[PDB]
Amino acid sequence: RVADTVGTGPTNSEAIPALTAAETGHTSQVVPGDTMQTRHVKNYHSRSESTIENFLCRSACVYFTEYENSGAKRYAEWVLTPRQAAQLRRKLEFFTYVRFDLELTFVITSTQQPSTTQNQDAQILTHQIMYVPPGGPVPDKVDSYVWQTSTNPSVFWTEGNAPPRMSIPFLSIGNAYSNFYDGWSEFSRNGVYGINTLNNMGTLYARHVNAGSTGPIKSTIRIYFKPKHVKAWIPRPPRLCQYEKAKNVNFQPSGVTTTRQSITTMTN
Amino acid sequence: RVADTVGTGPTNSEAIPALTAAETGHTSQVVPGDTMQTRHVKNYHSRSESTIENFLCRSACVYFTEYENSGAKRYAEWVLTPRQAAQLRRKLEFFTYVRFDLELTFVITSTQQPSTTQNQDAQILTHQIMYVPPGGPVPDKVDSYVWQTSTNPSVFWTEGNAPPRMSIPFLSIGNAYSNFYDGWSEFSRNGVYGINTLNNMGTLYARHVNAGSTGPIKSTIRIYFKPKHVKAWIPRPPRLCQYEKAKNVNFQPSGVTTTRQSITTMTN
Amino acid sequence: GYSDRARSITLGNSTITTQECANVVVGYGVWPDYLKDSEATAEDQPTQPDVATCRFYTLDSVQWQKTSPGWWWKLPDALSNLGLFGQNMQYHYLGRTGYTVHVQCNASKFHQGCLLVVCVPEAEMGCATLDNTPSSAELLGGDSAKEFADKPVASGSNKLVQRVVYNAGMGVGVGNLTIFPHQWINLRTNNSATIVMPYTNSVPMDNMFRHNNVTLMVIPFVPLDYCPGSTTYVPITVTIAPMCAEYNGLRLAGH
Amino acid sequence: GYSDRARSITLGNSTITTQECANVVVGYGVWPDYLKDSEATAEDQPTQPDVATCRFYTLDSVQWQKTSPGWWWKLPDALSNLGLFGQNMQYHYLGRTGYTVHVQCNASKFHQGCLLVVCVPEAEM
Amino acid sequence: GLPTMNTPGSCQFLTSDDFQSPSAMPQYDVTPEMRIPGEVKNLMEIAEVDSVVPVQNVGEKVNSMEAYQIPVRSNEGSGTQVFGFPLQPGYSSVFSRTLLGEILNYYTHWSGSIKLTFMFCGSAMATGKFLLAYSPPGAGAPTKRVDAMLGTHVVWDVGLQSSCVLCIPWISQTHYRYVTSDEYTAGGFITCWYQTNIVVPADAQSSCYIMCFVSACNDFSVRLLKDTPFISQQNFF
Amino acid sequence: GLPTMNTPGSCQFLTSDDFQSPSAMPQYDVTPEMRIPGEVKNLMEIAEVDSVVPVQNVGEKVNSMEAYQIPVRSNEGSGTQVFGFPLQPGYSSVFSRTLLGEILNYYTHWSGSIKLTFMFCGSAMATGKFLLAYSPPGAGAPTKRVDAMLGTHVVWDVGLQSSCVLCIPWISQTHYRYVTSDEYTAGGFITCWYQTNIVVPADAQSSCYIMCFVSACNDFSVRLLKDTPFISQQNFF
Amino acid sequence: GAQVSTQKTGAHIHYTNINYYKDAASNSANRQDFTQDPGKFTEPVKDIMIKSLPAL
Amino acid sequence: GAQVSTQKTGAHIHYTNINYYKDAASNSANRQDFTQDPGKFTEPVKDIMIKSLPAL
Amino acid sequence: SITTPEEMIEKAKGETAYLPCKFTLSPEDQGPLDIEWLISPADNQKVDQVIILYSGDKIYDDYYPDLKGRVHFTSNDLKSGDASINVTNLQLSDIGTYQCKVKKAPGVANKKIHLVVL
């Protein structure tokens, strides 16, 4: 809920709430009643939707890639990082350190490519998505022995069913993930600035278990990241300029804000 | 959970914990505090994921074979043995005797083969998987009378549905399965060395219940083995060289480990 | 009968005295303290010099001209070559410390100007190349103060930090910098700004060489102005004192 | 069932282990301790690093030849360029410290020899 | 074997749903929580912190530190307007980029009071009096100091106290407004005039500047979570 | 007839799941449990057992029993280095094949102390003193015995007691490290020097060897179960 | 072991939730967690400042 | 006959499980079974060896 | 990750140009290391032409005729982050764009160097 307005009457006194000093870095926190006559009001409005759990706990598409049932490209590999999509990324960059659980949902759709192949019979396509931990072996080819997934979590999905969903616990050698790292990985400071061993989750591999049809088919996989049980520390100013590279906060200088015809102008 | 570090101070005394004898075969078990000054630390780390149930209870692909809806090969037969796949096998070979429950999951995918057949109409393909106990009759042909499965457990699966799954109780004439058998089945020692009547489960038969379409179709079945309620006895050293034959521990001599430029070298 | 705008801070063998101050900003309400036995990780006993390491270290002054864009400092890096503090980290692998930033600047009633003193943790700065990262020398200036650029830095193939004052090198609005602990010096009301910062990092302790926990930035929103016959040269001295410092991982000196 | 000629001393992050020692001579019966508030003179608070300064510092070895006359060291001077201890005094006017001297030398049963280890305060030469 | 009947909405993926999913890694021990300062539990706390607002956002000034500063001087006249802007924190260019405006762009409705703090940045000898004022909707933006006085106003006198705070009271027909520009839910007009002329002594600048800080009150709320237009992307990074 | 609604993740096969399945054979009596020695209930117990480590893994020595042995001798010099290797049990070649290294390859993170036991394998008349030492990260591998002494070190004297144990303390910024090689989470450097020269009598070998045993402490844990790269397969057996 | 909690309702009813996984990170989001503490960001000053009293 | 147990949670909540088969080998894995007894592998010696006392 | 991937090197004729392509690998990277040095000519003729290739722990020095026995890897480790080449005889033709590719699955890193000879 929120604070209720308090009724006030005309007051003549030495007390001066409005006068203050902004140099102290202290917010004035002056209610409307201090500077004007108000009427008692019983506010029933509640700050429920402005909470971090409500703000950050929504599914947002972070990356979509495609693969084929034939040809050179037969499998797709993506390393887990949320800086791929500007939207979810900007919301996350609001704070310095964030600790949260992760929920992954994948939407897979297959589109038949143009071909001269005739008498095409298609069998229900089955897709396998394998998650590889950091330092784990990565499959060289689509028909590699790695796809055994003995100790690697993997999900098998058949088309016409609800999208596959799995819940990942917070993984970080450090106490919390770091959105911004100031420094170099090397003790000699001769490496890419801002690189951190933190925020490393894993790599996702997606392929077709079976060819399905003689004719060519291309499938696109979209990865959705929904934060859960989120925690935030040290709030910082929101991004003002468009993101150029995921690896570095490199930006192009941008006008503080939009202009107007002149001061004293009530319109844009 | 794990042990908490204990704070220590400089000590001058006759007691000599670091000095010991490795000939006794006894691990020294010396904490950091015995040889240096430490600060009290309240460790909250827990050895949960290192348990045998957590280590071995994961689904791992052990064998995949294919069959057709026409032609010579119409059914596929595989005898139950986990030595087919090196991954799951190496994890199991960590101990000498292991007793555990077994869970089987099968993933079946059908791919249309190239053909000159025209006007191909496909009907939802139904696959039958039959488990045969040791000493049970084995079907000679796809349309044999054995597929009645009166006393043989069998599962019927239709494409577009979740993969079929069944739970098998520990089966072994002996008290526990034996990973390594030293000896001969024959009292006269004139037979294949290491053969044991133990670890014999059964044979799996997979076929298409109906042809489905005039055009040729080939389906591949993958068998997954997930151990449950596992127990381990007598730990042994992990495999150092690549597996050659499932039947015998035959190996090719392999370098103890990788080499480096010289001793005193900090890199590979 | 004490005065609200009168104060004195005593750390080690150094004392600062201000007769015209606004107040003291204690970070996010947390006062510098040592590591507890529950949140610690390094099993070895921590070494705390306390008197030698924690004391006021005065850096070189800067000149506040009418066109001065702004200046910035790396708190861990700045004191790396000064006193025992600098020596201590040279011989220690890990280091955890808090700071008290007392920016000093004075002018006559006739002089009019305004400055912003703010401590920004993890201030990752951008680079003009838009493909490379800023060089160590450009980002870090030990025994010096790195300055901001009014006009945008030229884009080319090199490692130069975008010194744009309005984006401040972090690609964010300069006006939104008040979210972090900060204080304002106006030559009509303030003569100094004092800020106390608690140690803030994801990990319990971290390397003090390749990693910088906080960054001090002094930016004038309203420029320095005065009539002729007045004092043209106006300096700014920054005094930083470590608080509750402690180190772990004794080794041969170096980086 | 400990052995009389077996010992181990742990200071800071360094540990020495001897499996053939005679005993330990504690000066004139006084064990190194800090300055009391009654016998002190400097009014300023003393700084005690403790873990960094107090730890074993191994000096360069010497060769014991058949004609070796003898060797000598200045304890405060010897450690002036080693570790934080050396750095600490470089930045401090006054300094008060105690020491533990562990001379090490080993030889086979067949080898025969004899050495004298002694600490002489104020050895004006 | 329990009889079950599915309902409309089965096997569907709603981005904003709250269901339970299986864990990809079972029995995983996460790192213990560590005490980190400035923990945030609600977005409003961030929006209650004063943010510098660039009132003079005109021409090339938005590319310089001059946009934030507000000019005042000694003029042989009275009743002149220091500045003027509408009460549109979500839509107006002046507030669209403030900590308040940046947060108000992820929500559809907003209801509460707004605090405006003005800090005189002149010399100690410089003195003056201004008329900070807020005018309700349904009346044309006041053009003279006579018209502006009618609405909520605060006479500010330069003094040892560096800043004076003007608190815009919440005066609306409906319980909430719209962050996007909307004629029906008109906010109001905020203007500043010269109550008295700036007075300076000899060998002292007659041209000074002012700083504006905008934060929210203890009765400010937002609703309907929506995406922010500002951030744009044509390809992945 | 109960109304039901499916959610995202229905009819999916997650390898690491914990659900109930029907029994292929109903009412089956299994063989009664028998008491077998050396029962294992946790992988860590196996990893706490001393494992011989081949420090001298150079050239063709890895194909012989010489890789495990470490050479020492009587040399007219002092302060020389017996050996040197980094603290990387999961990645370093020296520890990649030990009982500890073999188990650390199925996990991603590892956090705890490590015990190194050195057993002198010379004659009874042979005597000597070595300086076992561990140096923290952020400093170059020590090149002389002066530099090495600065870090955690243990003076070892040959005596009736055959072996001396060096316990590497856990000194890391983060709570865990990475089993795979990683620059950010640098472990440290372990080196051995000659505190005193080896001294032997007449008609006695001046060349001896040492054995190293590496085990984990009572505060060692691992996380993130992953597959081991070592085992490879191109076809079924 | 069912947890009964109050549904989000307007001003001027109940729901039952059970956990089917022991993982706990497999649970739903804590939507009903409204706590406010802006004092640190708004006033992180050392000496408390009363509004009635003048700042300096 | 529902069994309520504690979920795996971090340091520094509950789940209900029912068995729908009488087979019992049809149950889920016993993930929460953490027991440590390395004494047999580390020290299988006949005479207990105290660290303070010298080995031989 | 390659340090300063975009850069420009200026050297006089016959001065031996050293091109630095030092990289750093992430934990996920576990695939075979493949280095590929491809040169784009300033002549405006066919571009993306390879000069020197390092794969399967072996080196190939014959993919571009003009540079015959002139391109050698500066470091002999190569697995180490440092993967640099140096042209011994700088010539007027040398002017062009040189691209360095470090491919270790998952993740590919590329560095582009503009070479000008005075």
Report how far apart, in Å, the C-alpha atoms of A268 and of each of A262, A265, E66, E171, G4 are: 10, 8, 19, 23, 51
Torsions phi, psi for B147 (to 5 deg): -60, 5
Q: Are B90 and B239 in contact (CB under 8 A)?
A: yes
CB-CB neighbors (< 8 A) of E10 in chain F = 4-6
CA pair distance F75, F77, nearest whole angstrom: 5
Chains G and D touch (3+ CB pairs under 8 A): no
List the structure tokens of B160.
């577009």
List the structure tokens of D103.
């001379």
Contact F155 D13 (CB under 8 A): no
Dihedral sign, Cα of residue F118, residue F85, residue F180, residue B242: negative
CA pair distance A128, B220, nearest whole angstrom: 14
Q: According to the 3-state scheme, what is the secondary structure of chain A? A: CCCCCCCCCCCCCCCCCCEECCCCCCCCCCCHHHHCCCCCCCCCCCCCCCEHHHHHCCCEEEEEEEEECCCCCCEEEEECCHHHCHHHHHHHCCEEEEEEEEEEEEEEEEEECCCCCCCCCCCCCEEEEEEECCCCCCCCCCCCHHHHCCCCCEEEEECCCCCCEEEECCCCCCCCEECCCCEECCCCCCCCECCCCCCCCCEEEEEECCCCCCCCEEEEEEEEEEEEEEEEEEECCCECCCCCCCCCCCCCCCCCCCCECCCCCCCC
CA pair distance C121, C200, nearest whole angstrom: 8
Give the count of domains, chain C. 1
CA pair distance E125, C157, nearest whole angstrom: 51
CA pair distance F155, F192, nearest whole angstrom: 10
C186 residue type, one letter:
N
- Bridge partners of C225, per DSSP, are C112
Contact F1 E6 (CB under 8 A): no
Which of F155, F166, F214, H50 shows the shortest CA–CA distance to B18? F166
CA pair distance E191, E134, nearest whole angstrom: 7
Query: Is some CB atom of chain F closer than 8 A to the CB atom of D111?
Result: yes
CA B99 to chain CA mean position, Å:
13
Q: Are B229 and H30 in contact (CB under 8 A)?
A: yes
- Bridge partners of B218, per DSSP, are B68, B111
Neighbouring chains of F at 3+ CB pairs within 8 Å?
A, B, C, D, E, H, I
CB nearest G1 (choices: H9, H14, H32):
H14
CA pair distance F38, C198, nearest whole angstrom: 52
Rounded to 5°, the CA angle B187-B192-B197 comes to 65
Q: According to the 3-state scheme, what is the secondary structure of chain B? A: CCCCCCCCCCEEECCCCCEECCCCCCCCCCCHHHHCCECCCCCCCCCCCCEHHHHHCCCEEEEEEEEECCCCCCEEEEECCHHHCHHHHHHHCCEEEEEEEEEEEEEEEEEECCCCCCCCCCCCCEEEEEEECCCCCCCCCCCCHHHHCCCCCEEEEECCCCCCEEEECCCCCCCCEECCCCCECCCCCCCCECCCCCCCCCEEEEEECCCCCCCCEEEEEEEEEEEEEEEEEEECCCCCCCCCCCCCCCCCCCCCCCCECCCCCCCC
List the structure tokens of A173.
């050698």
Q: Are B184 and F55 in contact (CB under 8 A)?
A: no
CA pair distance E207, A100, nearest whole angstrom: 52
Exposure class string for B107-120: b at 16+ Cβ within 10 A, else e = bbbbbbbebeeeeb
Contact E28 B49 (CB under 8 A): yes
Give the count of domains, chain F. 1
Q: Are E99 and A237 in contact (CB under 8 A)?
A: yes
CA pair distance E151, E133, nearest whole angstrom: 7
Which of B262, B20, D109, D61 shows the shortest CA–CA distance to F194? D61
CA distance to partner chain H, nearest, from residue D1 (Å): 6
Q: Which residue of C has its CA nearest to E103?
A: C176
Q: Are C186 and E86 in contact (CB under 8 A)?
A: no
Q: How many CB atoms lie within 10 A of CB A66?
A: 14
Q: How many CB atoms lie within 10 A of CB E80?
A: 13
CA A109 to chain CA mean position, Å:
22
CA pair distance C198, C29, nearest whole angstrom: 9
Which of A51, A239, B44, A95 shows the shortest CA–CA distance to C200? A95
Q: How many CB atoms lie within 10 A of CB B133?
A: 14
Q: Which residues contact B131 (CB under 8 A, 6 or more apart)?
A: B152, B153, B154, B202, B203, B204, F24
Torsions phi, psi for C178 (to 5 deg): -70, -15
CB-CB neighbors (< 8 A) of A209 in chain B = 107, 109
CA distance to partner chain H, nearest, from residue E33 (Å): 6
Report how far apart, in Å, the C-alpha atoms of F157 and of each of B114, D21, E225 are: 78, 11, 71
Query: Is some CB atom of chain D closer than 8 A to the CB atom of F139?
Result: no
Q: How many CB atoms lie within 10 A of CB A17?
A: 19
Contact C45 B40 (CB under 8 A): no
CA pair distance B54, E25, nearest whole angstrom: 10
Q: How many CB atoms lie within 10 A of CB A114?
A: 7
Burial class (CB in 10 A: 0-12, 13-18, 19+), D40: exposed
φ/ψ region of A194 (left if φ > 0, alpha if ψ in -120 to 50, else beta) reads left
List the structure tokens of F78.
């002092």
CA pair distance H24, H18, nearest whole angstrom: 11
Q: According to the 3-state scheme, what is the secondary structure of D30-83? A: CCCCCCCCCCCCCCCCCCCCCCCCCCCCCCCCCCCCCCCCCCCCCHHHHHHHCH
Which of C64, C103, C14, C23 shows the shortest CA–CA distance to C232? C64
Domain that holds residue E86: 1-237
CA distance to partner chain C, nearest, from residue B265 (Å): 19
Contact C189 G39 (CB under 8 A): no
Three-state SS for F31? coil
Neighbouring chains of I at 3+ CB pairs within 8 Å?
A, C, F
CA pair distance B106, B159, nearest whole angstrom: 12
CB-CB neighbors (< 8 A) of D6 in chain H = 54
Torsions phi, psi for H43 (to 5 deg): -130, 90
DSSP string, F116-161: EEEEE-S-SS-EEEEEEEEE-TTS----SHHHHHTSEEEEEE--SS
Query: Is some CB atom of chain B closer than 8 A to the CB atom of A79?
Result: no
Contact E6 F4 (CB under 8 A): yes
φ/ψ region of F106 (left if φ > 0, alpha if ψ in -120 to 50, else beta) reads alpha
Q: Which residue of D has its CA nearest to F169?
A: D13
Breaks (C-N over 2.5 A) in chain C follow: none
CA pair distance B159, E119, nearest whole angstrom: 73
Dihedral sign, Cα of residue D96, residue D97, residue D98, residue D101: negative
CA pair distance C154, A255, nearest whole angstrom: 16
Show the beta-strand stretches assigned E in G1-56. 3-6, 14-17
CA distance to partner chain F, nearest, from residue B85 (Å): 6
Contact E33 H10 (CB under 8 A): yes
Domain edges within chain I: 1-118
The structure's method of determination equals cryo-EM
In angstroms, how far apart are the furthest CA atoms of chain I? Answer: 43
Chains D and E touch (3+ CB pairs under 8 A): no
DSSP-assigned letter for residue C9: E
- C243: enclosing H helix or E strand: strand C235-250
Strands D14-18 and F152-157 turn out to be: parallel
Q: How many CB atoms lie within 10 A of CB F60?
A: 10
- Helix (H) and strand (E) counts in chain I: 0, 9
CB-CB neighbors (< 8 A) of I105 in chain A = 77, 138, 140
B135 residue type, one letter:
G
Residue F22: asked if its preceding bond is cis (omega within 30°), the reply is: no
Q: According to the 3-state scheme, what is the secondary structure of F48-67? A: CCCEECCCCCECCHHHCCCC
Per the document, the length of chain I is 118
CA pair distance D44, C51, nearest whole angstrom: 10
Contact I27 F182 (CB under 8 A): yes
DSSP string, chain E: ---EEE-TTTT---SS------BSSSS-PPPPP---SSEESBHHHHHTS-EE--S--BTTGGGSTTTT-EEEE--S-SS-EEEEEES-TTTSHHHHTSHHHHHTTSEEEEES-EEEEEEE-S-SS-EEEEEEEEE-TTS----SHHHHHTSEEEEEE--SS-EEEEEE----SSS---SS--STT---EEEEEEEEEEE--SSS-SEEEEEEEEEE-TT-EEEEE---SS---SS--
Q: How many CB atoms lie within 10 A of CB F78?
A: 15
Q: Which residues contact A10 (CB under 8 A, 6 or more apart)?
A: A37
Q: Which residues contact D104 (CB under 8 A, 6 or more apart)?
A: D18, F129, F155, F157, F195, F196
Contact F160 H31 (CB under 8 A): no
Contact E33 H31 (CB under 8 A): no
Torsions phi, psi for H5 (to 5 deg): -135, 160
CB-CB neighbors (< 8 A) of E33 in chain B = none
3-state helix, strand, coil in chain D (%, to 5): 15, 10, 80
Q: Are A163 and F16 in contact (CB under 8 A)?
A: no
| Strand order from edge to edge, sheet including C71-74 | C146-147, C71-74, C214-219, C114-121, C182-186
Radius of gyration, CA atoms only, chain C:
19
CA F79 to chain CA mean position, Å:
27
Torsions phi, psi for F120 (to 5 deg): -65, 125
Residues of E with CB under 8 A from a CB of F: 2-7, 9-13, 17, 19, 21-26, 28-29, 31-32
B with E: how many residue pairs have Cβ under 8 Å apart? Answer: 12
Three-state SS for I62? coil
CB-CB neighbors (< 8 A) of H54 in chain D = 1-3, 6
CA pair distance E50, E117, nearest whole angstrom: 8
CA pair distance E43, E220, nearest whole angstrom: 11
CB-CB neighbors (< 8 A) of F155 in chain D = 14-17, 56, 58, 104
CB-CB neighbors (< 8 A) of F154 in chain D = 14-17
Q: Which residue of E has its CA nearest to F19?
A: E22
Q: Which residue of G has its CA nearest to A167?
A: G26
Burial class (CB in 10 A: 0-12, 13-18, 19+), H51: middle
CB-CB neighbors (< 8 A) of B36 in chain C = 44
Report how far apart, in Å, the C-alpha atoms of C194 and of each of B251, C23, C191, F183 are: 73, 7, 10, 38
Neighbouring chains of E at 3+ CB pairs within 8 Å?
A, B, C, F, G, H
Termini Cα distance of chain C: 52
Q: Are C239 and C56 in contact (CB under 8 A)?
A: yes
Q: Are E166 and A35 in contact (CB under 8 A)?
A: yes
Strands C192-197 and C24-25 turn out to be: parallel
Q: Are C120 and C96 in contact (CB under 8 A)?
A: no
Q: Which residues contact C30 (CB under 8 A, 6 or more apart)?
A: C198, E37
φ/ψ region of I102 (left if φ > 0, alpha if ψ in -120 to 50, else beta) reads beta
D81 residue type, one letter:
N
List the structure tokens of A178.
């770091």
CA pair distance F236, F234, nearest whole angstrom: 7
- Bridge partners of I101, per DSSP, are I36, I110
CB nearest E33 (choices: H8, H12, H31):
H12
- Bridge partners of I50, per DSSP, are I38
CA pair distance I25, I3, nearest whole angstrom: 12
E91 residue type, one letter:
Y
Burial class (CB in 10 A: 0-12, 13-18, 19+), I59: middle
With tokens 């008692």, the residue in question is A40
Q: How many CA atoms lie within 13 A of A210 on its CB side?
A: 28
Q: Are A185 and C211 in contact (CB under 8 A)?
A: no
CA pair distance D77, D64, nearest whole angstrom: 23
Which of C114, C104, C128 shows the shortest CA–CA distance to C194? C104
Which of A65, A59, A134, A157 shows the shortest CA–CA distance to A102? A59
Contact H56 F161 (CB under 8 A): yes
Resolution in A: 3.2
Q: Which residues contact B152 (CB under 8 A, 6 or more apart)?
A: B130, B131, B132, B133, B136, B146
CA pair distance E231, A43, nearest whole angstrom: 34
Q: Are A80 and A104 in contact (CB under 8 A)?
A: no
CA pair distance E134, E142, nearest whole angstrom: 10
Q: Are A43 and G12 in contact (CB under 8 A)?
A: no
Report how far apart, in Å, the C-alpha atoms of D65 and of each of D62, D113, F76 are: 9, 11, 12
Q: How many CB atoms lie within 10 A of CB I19?
A: 19
Q: Which residues contact B147 (CB under 8 A, 6 or more apart)?
A: B128, B130, B139, B154, B207
Query: Is some CB atom of chain C closer than 8 A to the CB atom of E51?
Result: yes
Contact E11 F9 (CB under 8 A): no
